[PDB]
A paper describes a structure:
Drosophila PGRP-LB belongs to the amidase PGRPs and downregulates the immune deficiency (IMD) pathway by cleaving meso-2,6-diaminopimelic (meso-DAP or DAP)-type PGN. The structure of the PGRP domain comprises three α-helices and one central β-sheet composed of six β-strands, similar to the bacteriophage T7 lysozyme, a zinc-dependent amidase. We generated mutants to characterize the amidase reaction mechanism and solved the X-ray structures of wild-type Drosophila PGRP-LBPA/PC and its mutants in apo form or complexed to TCT.
The analysis of these results, including the first structure of a catalytic PGRP associated with TCT, highlighted the dynamic role of the residue Y78 in the amidase activity. Whereas the tetra-peptide is well defined, the carbohydrate moiety of TCT is not visible in the electron density. The absence of the electron density for the carbohydrate moiety of the TCT in the PGRP-LBPA/PC complexed structure is most probably due to its high flexibility. There are two possible pockets that can accept the sugar moiety of the ligand (annotated P1 and P2 in Figure 3A). The second pocket (P2) could accommodate the sugar moiety of the TCT. The structure obtained here also shows another interesting interaction with a fourth coordination of Zn2+ made with the oxygen from the amide group of the TCT, which highlights the important role of Zn2+ in the enzymatic reaction. This interaction would increase the electrophilic character of the carbonyl group of the amide function where the amidase activity is occurring.
Numbering used by the authors: 3 to 7, 14 to 177
């Protein structure tokens, strides 16, 4: 249990300040998909904002990290939540934190498929990142489980992203 004990800004969802921020240069060559597992899927915007605060609190206060570990969160409201954001060194996938966008789809996606507004938000965030130059045009799309011993992002979500553009073995 790693994460619990339109594009919204960190201030939109009530984020605490990061303890510290480290940047990396250049478009990210990797996009790494996660699920939260806990907390659960969130359908209202205020519930998704609370999930982002709860994950941030677990990461900062219990794991002692600088900030929520992920670059971005996706809610069941179909909104994108800024975590550390583009070109900020993450805390979601060791050896890939300084070279990836880590996207968490809030919820447990081991057996259930995220609803379509969540899959669309994640695809749109990546396309946006590519267009604006934050994500390398030859990026590789991975699930967390491809680079670390974990079930993340869940079997069902991992099978879904296996079908997406730039999915890489
Ligand atoms: C769900 C899910 O996958 N949750 C994520 C947040 C998770 O727990 N992933 C950890 C990430 C652990 C992590 O990356 N921690 C940072 C800790 C960073 C602490 C501090 N430097 C910070 O930036 O907050 C780290 O090890 N970084 C090193 C230097 C690396 O990139 O190789 C894992 O895969 O074990
Ligand atoms: Zn993960």
């Amino acid at each position: 249990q790693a994460n619990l004990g339109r594009l919204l800004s960190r201030s939109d969802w009530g984020a605490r300040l990061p303890k510290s921020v480290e940047h990396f240069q250049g478009p990210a060559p990797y996009v790494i998909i996660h699920h939260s597992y806990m907390p659960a899927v969130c359908y209202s915007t205020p519930d998704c904002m609370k999930s982002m605060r709860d994950m941030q609190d677990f990461h900062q206060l219990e794991r002692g990290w600088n900030d929520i570990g992920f670059s971005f969160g996706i809610g069941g409201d179909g909104m994108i939540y800024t975590g550390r954001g583009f070109n900020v060194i993450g805390a979601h996938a060791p050896k890939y934190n300084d070279k990836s966008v880590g996207i968490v789809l809030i919820g447990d996606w081991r057996t259930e498929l995220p609803p379509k507004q969540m899959l669309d938000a994640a695809k749109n965030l990546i396309a946006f990142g590519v267009f604006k130059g934050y994500i390398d045009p030859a990026y590789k799309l991975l699930g967390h489980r491809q680079v670390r011993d974990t079930e993340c992002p869940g079997g069902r979500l991992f099978a879904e992203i296996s079908s997406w553009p730039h999915f890489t073995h």
